Design a protein around this ligand. Sequence first.
Ligand code: CLA
Ligand code: CLA
Ligand code: CLA
Ligand SMILES: CC(/C=C/C=C(C)/C=C/[C@@]12O[C@]1(C)C[C@@H](O)CC2(C)C)=C\C=C\C=C(C)\C=C\C=C(C)\C=C\[C@@]12O[C@]1(C)C[C@@H](O)CC2(C)C
Ligand SMILES: CC1=C(/C=C/C(C)=C/C=C/C(C)=C/C=C/C=C(C)/C=C/C=C(C)/C=C/C2=C(C)CCCC2(C)C)C(C)(C)CCC1
Ligand SMILES: CC1=C(C/C=C(\C)CCC[C@H](C)CCC[C@H](C)CCCC(C)C)C(=O)c2ccccc2C1=O
Lengths: 41, 75, 180, 74, 120, 160, 735
Amino acid sequence: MKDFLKYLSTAPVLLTAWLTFTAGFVIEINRFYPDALTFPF
Amino acid sequence: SIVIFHFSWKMQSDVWGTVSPTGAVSHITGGNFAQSSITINGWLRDFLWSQAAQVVQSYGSSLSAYGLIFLGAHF
Amino acid sequence: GLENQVGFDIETGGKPWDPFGFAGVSERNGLGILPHIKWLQESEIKHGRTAMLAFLGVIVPGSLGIYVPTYPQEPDFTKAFSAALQSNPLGMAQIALAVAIIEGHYYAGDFWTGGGDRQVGAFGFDPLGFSKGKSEAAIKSMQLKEIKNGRLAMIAMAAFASEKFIPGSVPLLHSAFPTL
Amino acid sequence: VIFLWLSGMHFHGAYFSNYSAWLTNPTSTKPSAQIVWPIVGQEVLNADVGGNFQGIQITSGFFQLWRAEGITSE
Amino acid sequence: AMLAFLGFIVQEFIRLPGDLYSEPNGVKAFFQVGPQPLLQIFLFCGFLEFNMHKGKLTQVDMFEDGKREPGNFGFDPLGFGKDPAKRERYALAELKNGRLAMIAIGGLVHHALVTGHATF
Amino acid sequence: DIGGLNPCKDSEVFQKRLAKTVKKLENRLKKYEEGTPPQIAIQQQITQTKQRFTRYADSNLLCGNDGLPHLITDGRWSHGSEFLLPSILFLYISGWIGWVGRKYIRTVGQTSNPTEKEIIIDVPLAISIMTSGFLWPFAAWQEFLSGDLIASDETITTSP
Amino acid sequence: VYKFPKFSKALAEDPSTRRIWYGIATAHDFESHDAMTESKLYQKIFASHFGHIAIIFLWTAGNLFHVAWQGNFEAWILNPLKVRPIAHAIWDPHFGQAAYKAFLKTSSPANLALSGVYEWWYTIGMRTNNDLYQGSFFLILLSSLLLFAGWLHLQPSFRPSLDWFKANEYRLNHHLSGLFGVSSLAWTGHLVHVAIPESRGIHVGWDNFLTVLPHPEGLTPFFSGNWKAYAQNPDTASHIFGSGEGSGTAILTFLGGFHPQTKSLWLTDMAHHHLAIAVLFIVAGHMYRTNWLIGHQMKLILEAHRPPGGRLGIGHIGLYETITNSLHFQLGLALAALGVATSLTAQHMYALPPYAFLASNFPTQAALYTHHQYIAGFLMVGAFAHGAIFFVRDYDPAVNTRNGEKNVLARMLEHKEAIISHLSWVSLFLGFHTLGIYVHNDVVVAFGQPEKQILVEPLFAEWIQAASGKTLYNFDLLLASSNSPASVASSQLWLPGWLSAINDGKNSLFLPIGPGDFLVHHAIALGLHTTTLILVKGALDARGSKLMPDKKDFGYSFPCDGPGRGGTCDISAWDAFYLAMFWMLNTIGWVTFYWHWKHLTLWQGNQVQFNESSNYIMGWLRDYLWLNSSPLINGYNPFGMNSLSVWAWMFLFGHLVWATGFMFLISWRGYWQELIETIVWAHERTPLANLVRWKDKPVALSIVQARLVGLAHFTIGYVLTYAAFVIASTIGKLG
Ligand code: CLA
Ligand code: CLA
Ligand code: CLA
Ligand SMILES: CC(/C=C/C=C(C)/C=C/[C@@]12O[C@]1(C)C[C@@H](O)CC2(C)C)=C\C=C\C=C(C)\C=C\C=C(C)\C=C\[C@@]12O[C@]1(C)C[C@@H](O)CC2(C)C
Ligand SMILES: CC1=C(/C=C/C(C)=C/C=C/C(C)=C/C=C/C=C(C)/C=C/C=C(C)/C=C/C2=C(C)CCCC2(C)C)C(C)(C)CCC1
Ligand SMILES: CC1=C(C/C=C(\C)CCC[C@H](C)CCC[C@H](C)CCCC(C)C)C(=O)c2ccccc2C1=O
């Protein structure tokens, strides 16, 4: 698991993981607080 | 693209449709392929413009994704 | 550079107070786009003198009730300018002309890139010999007193504006100037 | 990869489809085998395909193929 | 976490005078108190963070020059810790209490969420 | 008010839009049966539509003649939650991203194989830099002061 | 295979068909011709200018003659709001009986006139088909004059020298004062003398003009100084144009706004405008020094303008010799000024219609705006292209540099990377966010929840409208307030006319704007910035870059530098023009789409259709293009045809030319050379055709020629299809 972790450190895998996480928290914010046109405050 | 356009228009105009109980055949477009598919203006108007009505009027309906993909594919 | 200039005292340690390093941005990238320290110091002196004069001009007319005879009796600095602009247009015009002449004679435009014959707020203007003959340290101390009083007046005028805009921003203000 | 794709198609037919309703009314129920999650207002894509079902109408003809195979249950 | 656990136990017991400070439940008190008192706590904690670490606040900036024992702010006004013999025991006790308080702070917060009344 | 607009709480066309959307959703709801998942989904749609319209009404939002919320982005703090606060939020987040990217580029640019560490990210160092971007406004106005933010003449130039 | 490119021996020795193609495309590049001097260059350019002005005058004379002969100008005078102007008659042998019947107007098939010449000539005081004939005769005489002058100034004793051509001060004095001021003075004379009485029913022709006083007092107030007398008793609010009912006697007035009947600017307003312009330009024409010891030497003015602190380098010291010795710098400046000027014409002739009954001529309004905006884009791209050409072949760094320090122009090549980077940043910023908001609106509306749209009220632009007096946005700012000093100052001169026109829903003066206007203006800004980025990058990088640090040695237009160094396709400055032409066409398309849709909704009355559907892309596609294309495509159907049949044919023709451009752009050379070789073998190896052989070896079009041909097809198809669409849609929708 020394080269597998290095493989997971490559640009495509890291970008896919980061974009999946990013889309995930964006989608979940929009699920829990939907239809947010202005700042909540 | 020309092949699938020919298939779509010919089928809609001269095969597909409904049959009345007495045996009268009414097609989706109404047989306009025979007389209006012989000019480029006919293809532009009676096929592209005419059958693109459902795509452009799909907003707000369950087919709105098709309009969005229409616009995105144009883009 | 700030170590050899008037302006710092015991209130901020012994070092020149500059959290944002604005005095050292002139030497940074660009021929000149950000002011030199000389321009900043001249802005110091000008803003402080203007703030002291404005504090006197909001306190004396508005509170003490002293008014020039043929001028509107408005104890409010947010309307006095317009009221005098209509009531005595000639007086305001002459004030503007005098201000323009005074500033044009004492132009500070070569201070932006650093340089010039004048000093920071030199202006000559020593009628009643307050600095006639004094030690250099005494003159520096008087300049420091002037700068600190100018900063205090800046703060007071900003407090006036803030309380007028956002009520309750300065708590003791209306208890320290009971009249408007 | 092809086998995984086919397995996904059959799984969607089994779980997210109106295949049982379409079997009893092939001429009046539109085949649907993909339901859309209710996010950012995209649930409008769940069409009235019939058979007490909401989803995207399927144009791949899997329902007809499954019926021709004799598959009568999900 | 230790300060926050003590805050729970005191808040449900003592509380402050006033309509705002009248919720025995910490989770509901977070909402009733309003944003103004909380933002002041946030800014004060930020001021503390800045002045205690003396500018170097980030993972790459802190410990860049070394000479910084982890967790050593020099805070010791009452003088506990002059004797080095008990210093190691005090450090271990602080670490264990901190870990226990992290677990307990999570426990109390989630108890308030699933029940809603208080900790008691 | 501003620009001839009116608050959406008093805009008749806004309420007409809400009523029409609710009526369409209820008509769609009529064609399903009992407490079946389709009816639950349509009811959730109706509830969310009502909540969204109510929130937009009570949001200091100005509506035009079409009954749609218009954004006042001239800079006034009265409508500050429409553009200004999201603007600050995005500026913070994007400055964070740019700062951590620049810091990673400059950090692995002083190693033996700078190009290797760009396709194969040093995840430990990347995580170290990324969580340090919360001070990007302060770090930027501490590196610009020291002259470490801008290159001067080592930058390359074309022939003319 | 010889003697055709007389100006180029290198081309005349080409054994292929490339010689013929390049002979056409290099005929006007006089600086590159064989045995070339500067004196011959300026003399040939001078003669070509004369021939060009003759061509322009002949074109105008032809328009006048064809309106006089086959038009219905006289009938249109008596009923301008119902009679449709006729451009010229049609005689085409290919017409069927149906086409003849559909195009039949009065006595012969004819084309409606969309140039607005009827309204323009009616406004300036033409009422007879014999007035137009006189104009055509006079213009042909002027064309003969210009052709004679062009021939004369190539004769040995009448060919001007370089000093005369480069005499800047004399040419400026004369151009400004004489051309602008005196032409404005003569136009004011005509306006008053002829146009003003003709709008009041009094005929002032070439017979009774020495005896019909333009004003009752008759030049007495002018010399006496009582200039107010020319403004007393203006035309009333019940004046019928071309008739004496409700008319006045004034000739120079301030009224502001429009005529209550023709919905156009007052003739007395325009006469006063031209008189003021004439006085100003005649005064300004005395600035520069000539043989009488007073005036300015522009070399001294340019050299003395160096900021003392020093931020523009050494200033403009080397600019005089740079501009004087370069014809591409001057051409670029002139083209940029002309582009801005014609953009101004387009933007003002719709908001402030100057001709009688032109506001109600919707097809001609749309045609005029589209024509002038396209010409504006062309002129701007030409200005930038000639700036790039100046950089390549006329710029001298030594002249623009004094002791290492560089002047104001040479410093543009030092921060060229900064300029290009910031243009790129602005373009990316605007594109990203305009497209993001548009697609957000698309998705949100499509999902059936239009309330979640992002609609930004254009407060900055509405602020400007309120400043000019529009009381629609409740700003109460400058002229929307009756107490502001801006309003009290002109309350007695031109506000009552101006306010009555700006605060009117039937005008195009300051059209009401909403979020759709905001988004489309940001799209326009993105288009302008991207076109500017391409053109500026090509101009600055014309002399070289990192990929080609000797690009100046290869000229303005060359195919490439080869596949080496990673590939150098489209690396020349000409290729930057070629790429920016697409962006200019796209930007002008956006501008004209916005204008046409806004005005179609305004004229039809459904302005709510634009205000709601213009915020998302599908709104545009469905409600502008798809909706208004219905009358056009039904110009001929399997059932019949209409007078719009020609427009549908032009629509399809434009699409075809566009796609042929796509041919020439996507498929490159090399693929067409081998095919041509196969065709050559086939011709050479076939009997009964071996008897015929080519003189020029057939070869594929060159890379640059192919790019030009594809661009020409793209542009011609673009222009033709949009002209057909706009005209046919306006005609078929608004009656
Ligand atoms: C283009 C603007 C401009 C320029 C270049 C000058 C130039 C000069 N002025 Mg001057 N001045 C101006 C406007 C200007 N003035 C205005 C509007 C007033 C108020 C009525 C004055 C009042 C004035 C006085 C009272 C005196 C000068 C003096 C001087 C001379 C040297 C001292 C000096 O600069 O300090 C004066 C500096 C200023 C007054 C600062 C003016 C800043 C201007 C308003 C900013 C304009 C820049 C702006 C970007 C222009 C926009 C261009 C375009 C978009 C329209 C110098 C020749 C002195 C002199 O005559 O020496 C013998 C002097 O005693 N000026
Ligand atoms: C009074 C004497 C006089 C007059 C009338 C002219 C007139 C002319 N000369 Mg000329 N010339 C003169 C003296 C004169 N010259 C002298 C003394 C010299 C020697 C120094 C020359 C040397 C010279 C050369 C070398 C050339 C000319 C050319 C021309 C012609 C220009 C093309 C044309 O038709 O433009 C017609 C233009 C108008 C009628 C007016 C244009 C209106 C503009 C576009 C509107 C602008 C309004 C406004 C500013 C827009 C901006 C809006 C604002 C808010 C900024 C024109 C006929 C050129 C030509 O074509 O030769 C045949 C040419 O090559 N001249
Ligand atoms: C008054 C304005 C003006 C003037 C004097 C010039 C003058 C010049 N330009 Mg220039 N140019 C202008 C405007 C102008 N241009 C504009 C507006 C643009 C932007 C489009 C350009 C773009 C441009 C480029 C890119 C180049 C020049 C070049 C040149 C030089 C040689 C021209 C040549 O060889 O022609 C050759 C003429 C042709 C090839 C004829 C082309 C005809 C086109 C394709 C239209 C014909 C089709 C027609 C519409 C048919 C209708 C179809 C029907 C079915 C409807 C010459 C100095 C060239 C040069 O080397 O400069 C040093 C060069 O490379 N110019
Ligand atoms: C602190 C915590 C959560 C705290 C939450 C807070 C403050 C929330 C505040 C808010 O909600 C409110 C109040 C209102 C909201 O609107 C806003 C916010 C602000 C969001 C969770 C901890 C949660 C802590 C957790 C889950 C700990 C799990 C520990 C495990 C599993 C340990 C296992 C072991 O210890 C054993 C068993 C044996 C050992 O030998 C080996 C190991 C393996 C180490
Ligand atoms: C490349 C090059 C070139 C070219 C360039 C170009 C092409 C440019 C363009 C340019 C342009 C195209 C520019 C534009 C400009 C504009 C402007 C500058 C404007 C201004 C305006 C104003 C200033 C206004 C103002 C106002 C207002 C706003 C309100 C009303 C009133 C008033 C008037 C006040 C050349 C050849 C030269 C040379 C070489 C290089
Ligand atoms: C189609 C095509 C061709 C082939 C087209 C050619 C060779 C033009 C064929 C001749 C045209 C049709 C004009 C024919 C004119 C008549 C022969 C009359 C003669 C007129 C001359 C005397 C001017 C290329 O050569 C080419 C080169 C580089 C990139 C793309 C392409 C490309 O797309």
